[PDB]
Amino acid sequence: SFTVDSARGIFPNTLTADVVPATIARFNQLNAEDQLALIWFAYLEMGKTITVAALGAANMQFAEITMNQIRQMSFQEQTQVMCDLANRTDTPISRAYGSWTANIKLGFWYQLGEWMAQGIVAPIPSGYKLSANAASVLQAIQGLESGQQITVLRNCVVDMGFDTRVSEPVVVPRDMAQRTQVTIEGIDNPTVLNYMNNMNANDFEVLIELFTPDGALQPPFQKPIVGKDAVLRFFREECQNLKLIPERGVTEPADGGYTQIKVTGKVQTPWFGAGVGMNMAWRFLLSPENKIFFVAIDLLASPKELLNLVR
Amino acid sequence: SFTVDSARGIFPNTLTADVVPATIARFNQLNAEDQLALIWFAYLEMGKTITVAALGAANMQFAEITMNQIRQMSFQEQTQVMCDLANRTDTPISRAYGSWTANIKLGFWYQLGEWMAQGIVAPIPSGYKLSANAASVLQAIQGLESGQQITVLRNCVVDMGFDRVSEPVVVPRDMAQRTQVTIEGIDNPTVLNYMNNMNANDFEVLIELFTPDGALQPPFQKPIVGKDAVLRFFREECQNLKLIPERGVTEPADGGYTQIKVTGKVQTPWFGAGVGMNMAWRFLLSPENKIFFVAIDLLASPKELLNLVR
Numbered sequence: 130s131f132t133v134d135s136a137r138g139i140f141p142n143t144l145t146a147d148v149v150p151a152t153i154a155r156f157n158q159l160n161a162e163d164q165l166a167l168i169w170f171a172y173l174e175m176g177k178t179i180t181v182a183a184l185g186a187a188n189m190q191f192a193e194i195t196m197n198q199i200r201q202m203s204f205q206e207q208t209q210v211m212c213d214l215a216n217r218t219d220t221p222i223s224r225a226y227g228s229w230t231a232n233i234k235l236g237f238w239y240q241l242g243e244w245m246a247q248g249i250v251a252p253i254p255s256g257y258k259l260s261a262n263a264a265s266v267l268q269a270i271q272g273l274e275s276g277q278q279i280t281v282l283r284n285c286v287v288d289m290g291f292d293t294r295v296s297e298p299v300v301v302p303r304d305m306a307q308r309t310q311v312t313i314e315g316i317d318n319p320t321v322l323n324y325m326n327n328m329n330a331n332d333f334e335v336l337i338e339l340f341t342p343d344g345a346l347q348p349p350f351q352k353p354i355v356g357k358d359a360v361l362r363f364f365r366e367e368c369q370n371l372k373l374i375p376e377r378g379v380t381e382p383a384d385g386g387y388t389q390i391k392v393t394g395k396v397q398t399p400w401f402g403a404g405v406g407m408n409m410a411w412r413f414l415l416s417p418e419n420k421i422f423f424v425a426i427d428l429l430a431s432p433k434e435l436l437n438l439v440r
Numbered sequence: 441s442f443t444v445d446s447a448r449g450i451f452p453n454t455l456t457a458d459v460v461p462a463t464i465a466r467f468n469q470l471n472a473e474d475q476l477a478l479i480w481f482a483y484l485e486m487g488k489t490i491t492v493a494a495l496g497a498a499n500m501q502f503a504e505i506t507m508n509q510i511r512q513m514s515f516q517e518q519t520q521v522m523c524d525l526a527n528r529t530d531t532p533i534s535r536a537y538g539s540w541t542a543n544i545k546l547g548f549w550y551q552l553g554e555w556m557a558q559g560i561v562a563p564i565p566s567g568y569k570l571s572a573n574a575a576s577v578l579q580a581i582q583g584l585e586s587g588q589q590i591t592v593l594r595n596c597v598v599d600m601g602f603d604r605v606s607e608p609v610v611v612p613r614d615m616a617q618r619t620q621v622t623i624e625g626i627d628n629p630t631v632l633n634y635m636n637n638m639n640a641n642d643f644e645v646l647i648e649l650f651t652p653d654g655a656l657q658p659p660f661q662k663p664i665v666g667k668d669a670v671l672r673f674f675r676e677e678c679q680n681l682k683l684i685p686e687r688g689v690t691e692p693a694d695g696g697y698t699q700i701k702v703t704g705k706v707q708t709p710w711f712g713a714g715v716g717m718n719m720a721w722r723f724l725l726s727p728e729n730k731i732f733f734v735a736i737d738l739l740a741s742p743k744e745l746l747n748l749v750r
């Protein structure tokens with residue numbers, strides 16, 4: 130009936146925010162110093178604050194030695210290390226950065242940014258002029274949805290340093306008594322509801338059992354992650370402490386007794402809490418036995434896409 | 441005084457056509473069947489005629505095995521191989537495709553395109569509808585200058601398959617038939633002979649213009665560092681181009697270095713005089729007048745051909 134690759138195209142009227150990869154591609158053309166300065170100004174205009182809970186994350190112990198070495202370097206040495214990271218140059222610090230998780234890399238740059246404000250780490254030079262191309266990229270970022278802006282910033286951060294490792298603890302699932310349950314207008318399918326509720330409870334061991342053995346999950350702007358082993362690994366490293374707020378859905382038959390379901394809603398990341406709500410869609414292809422053969426998670430082009438629930 | 445990474449920023453207000461990498465990134469989000477259909481329509485609706493001869497016999501002998509093997513497959517199997525390439529799947533055909541130079545990949549698809557119009561290779565299904573995202577990408581492409589359009593298409597094609605072939609020998613043009621460029625405002629022989637040696641396919645002489653550690657940065661790519669890697673890039677990528685530089689400016693840089701910017705047109709053998717690409721060359725020359733760094737940029741618009749600020 131279906132393959133993972135043939136499942137990718139379900140609900141093809143779904144308009145995803147491909148301006149996000151487009152803008153990252155433009156950013157990737159800039160030289161190291163331009164990139165660092167662009168992100169500094171983009172972060173400022175973003176006008177959103179990282180939560181205290183994320184700011185004190187215990188995983189930063191893996192980077193403490195590296196940050197404290199940078200803090201002691203001269204401004205000229207600090208600037209060179211930051212360019213090495215942006216250039217993806219092969220240096221020892223860049224290799225250590227490359228072994229870190231995404232959340233550690235983000236906390237690393239958050240700390241360096243705090244230090245630049247406090248006069249401890251070399252700042253963006255007072256008379257830096259963004260290149261013509263960089264200024265245009267900066268403007269484009271200012272015109273994005275807040276959810277789209279933080280996705281551009283995160284993906285730029287994650288891709289610096291050396292190409293691929295630190296292992297982090299996994300959050301403990303929320304107690305059954307403390308759990309909430311989602312309500313999706315138009316959807317009572319238990320597999321989809323269980324997906325949302327177990328995600329919100331960080332109950333990844335129950336979540337993975339919703340999938341077929343050859344099932345796949347496709348994160349935004351990434352290729353499908355195939356098989357329970359790889360999906361469970363992805364859940365444990367990337368999907369911690371999210372808040373999924375699905376609100377609307379539609380279900381319809383597919384070939385071979387399969388069912389395809391599209392859900393739209395908002396998602397909050399623990400980095401920003403309720404400060405940023407990203408507009409998402411989930412596209413499910415469910416087997417006749419009510420298991421997830423494929424789910425794609427998309428960042429939507431604009432809030433009106435929340436209402437786009439035709440077949 | 442300079443490093444390769446620090447040389448990248450010379451002439452920083454050169455406005456490049458970064459809509460090209462932006463659009464490629466959008467194309468990369470589409471599924472395989474949407475990608476193939478989009479290129480088919482873009483390729484058909486373009487008003488520019490391709491010429492082969494840009495190809496070469498020693499080049500296409502590498503893809504002949506694969507093309508004959510495809511021509512014997514059912515329509516079903518053909519679409520599968522065609523999707524495997526778009527998806528960059530690990531298959532032996534996708535691995536063979538991944539080992540080819542850009543021109544071999546292009547000639548391969550050119551032949552498949554002709555066979556599709558002939559009913560030999562499985563066509564795009566009749567009345568196929570592009571996804572919402574794919575329709576927007578197609579509209580963006582058809583809004584681009586033709587030079588930018590063909591750059592999007594090429595890069596889309598080059599990126600397919602699973603990521604070698606011994607690229608055949610390129611003998612330079614006979615000295616007597618050679619042209620000499622004229623660059624308004626530029627008499628530096630290292631810049632002039634860069635131009636003239638490229639136009640003559642004389643890459644073994646061209647590479648001697650570089651410093652031992654010199655770098656060349658192609659459009660929308662990272663620098664290629666060192667003579668060995670630059671030389672290999674010349675043979676695999678740079679055959680039968682026609683460079684038509686028009687003007688340039690020169691200015692001293694730190695440490696006895698010189699930086700030079702030239703703007704003009706480039707024609708590819710695939711399209712001849714039918715498509716002129718708007719290009720800037722940014723040179724950093726050592727105190728000994730060798731090329732330490734050269735960047736080649738695709739420019740955002742013809743307006744940028746006049747942007748020669750020291």
Ligand SMILES: CC1=C(/C=C/C(C)=C/C=C/C(C)=C/C=C/C=C(C)/C=C/C=C(C)/C=C/C2=C(C)C(=O)CCC2(C)C)C(C)(C)CCC1
Pocket residue numbers: 164165166168169172179235238239241242243279280282283286328348349367368371373396398400407409426
């Ligand atoms: C660098 C740099 C600097 C620092 C910049 C900083 C500090 C940037 C920080 C950016 C941050 C903190 C971004 C946070 C982004 C988080 C995101 C975008 C999370 C998205 C999560 C999603 C979308 C979840 C999706 C999913 C769902 C819903 C599923 O159902 C399946 C699983 C899962 C897929 C994953 C300084 C400025 C100072 C200047 C120099 C350069």
Ligand SMILES: CC1=C(/C=C/C(C)=C/C=C/C(C)=C/C=C/C=C(C)/C=C/C=C(C)/C=C/C2=C(C)C(=O)CCC2(C)C)C(C)(C)CCC1
Pocket residue numbers: 475476477479480483490546549550552553554556590591593594597638658659677678681683706708710717719736
């Ligand atoms: C797939 C596919 C199909 C076939 C599509 C085909 C058949 C597409 C062919 C497109 C072609 C033929 C594009 C050619 C583009 C060539 C370009 C863009 C060349 C640019 C070269 C430049 C700019 C040179 C720059 C340089 C200069 C000036 C230097 O000084 C230094 C070196 C060098 C840097 C390199 C079919 C539709 C049928 C349907 C299914 C999908």
